[PDB]
């Protein structure tokens, strides 16, 4: 479906340029054969002795013609195989994203969800064409952080509050992990393990290479617990429906 | 003719046919295996089963088709 919405011309180019290519080999199969019938005849007839001789010079403009489509078809067909790994990157965090809404969903009998419903957020963040953004860079960054702001707007409403700190601190993480560097990701783990009593790790802290990492530590050093909390879902740049 | 050598050349240009001769036994061996076992697997079962049969192809050396879809191979 996500390939289909971003660039379904490339689709369509593939299905038709198969569909052409197989139309072509057999074609040409058939005027294979009925040159070779022609060819088990001495010298034939008028349409064998001069007449399938401009038809093969058509058989050698089709075989041209197959040619250049097979060109254009070992031109696409790379491109194709190379771009999907965006989508395929899409792929692996929204799988990620479910398996945590299952997650919640077996703690209490309310917080279910079921395939039907992420596909159509899913949908939905390409069919809500958002105004001007923040530049995240090509299409696949821009277009996976609105489906993460989606799932959020569309399955927070589902879980209390304290669910509903607890799925946007993870969600925020799991973008975090791998859209940053891992220096990033240490020092968010340590600080959550902060956060918790039972395990901890060093309150550590950066400078200047993390800004709102220091916004952080400036909240838990002060022990403002709920700012620290709601940190997340304010800088992930939402509202609560 | 002038054309006989033209056709001459594209009918001997059965090279390609050469070369499908040697990747047969893997492609059969790999629908084969794809008909039998992978009636009951899922996607991702069926993708680390591919995966793990063409690494054995390569440790035993057999001739298989790269560009291999089972749909259109059948």
């Given at each position: 479906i996500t390939l289909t919405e971003e660039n379904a011309e490339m689709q369509r180019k593939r299905e038709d340029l198969i569909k052409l290519n197989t139309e072509y080999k057999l074609k040409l199969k058939n005027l294979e054969k009925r040159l070779l019938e022609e060819l088990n005849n001495s010298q034939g007839n008028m349409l064998e002795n001069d007449e399938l001789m401009v038809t093969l010079n058509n058989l050698k403009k089709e075989a041209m013609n197959i040619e250049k489509k097979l060109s254009e078809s070992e031109e696409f067909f790379p491109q194709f195989d190379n771009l999907v790994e965006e989508y395929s990157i899409i792929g692996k965090h929204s799988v990620k994203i479910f398996s945590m809404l299952e997650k919640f969903g077996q703690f209490?009998?309310?917080?279910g969800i079921s395939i039907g419903q992420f596909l159509s957020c899913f949908k939905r963040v390409f069919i809500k064409k958002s105004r001007e953004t923040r530049a995240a860079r090509t299409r696949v960054d821009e277009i996976l952080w609105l489906l993460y702001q989606e799932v959020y707007c569309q399955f927070s409403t589902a879980l209390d509050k304290k669910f509903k700190m607890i799925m946007a601190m993870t969600m925020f993480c799991l973008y975090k992990f791998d859209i940053e560097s891992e220096q990033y990701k240490e020092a968010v783990l340590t600080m959550i393990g902060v956060l918790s009593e039972s395990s901890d790790g060093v309150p550590k802290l950066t400078v200047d290479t993390n800004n709102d990492l220091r916004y952080l530590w400036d909240y838990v050093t002060t022990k403002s617990y709920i700012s620290a909390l709601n940190w997340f879902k304010n800088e992930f740049f939402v509202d609560e429906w | 003719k002038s054309l006989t050598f033209e056709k001459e050349r594209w009918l001997n240009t059965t090279k390609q046919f050469s070369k499908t001769s040697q990747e047969l036994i893997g492609n059969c061996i790999i629908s084969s295996i794809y008909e039998t076992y992978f009636g009951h697997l899922n996607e991702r079962e069926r993708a680390d089963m591919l995966v793990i049969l063409k690494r054995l192809l390569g440790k035993f050396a057999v001739k298989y088709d790269v560009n291999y879809r089972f749909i259109d191979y059948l």
């Open positions: 209490h009998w309310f917080y | -």
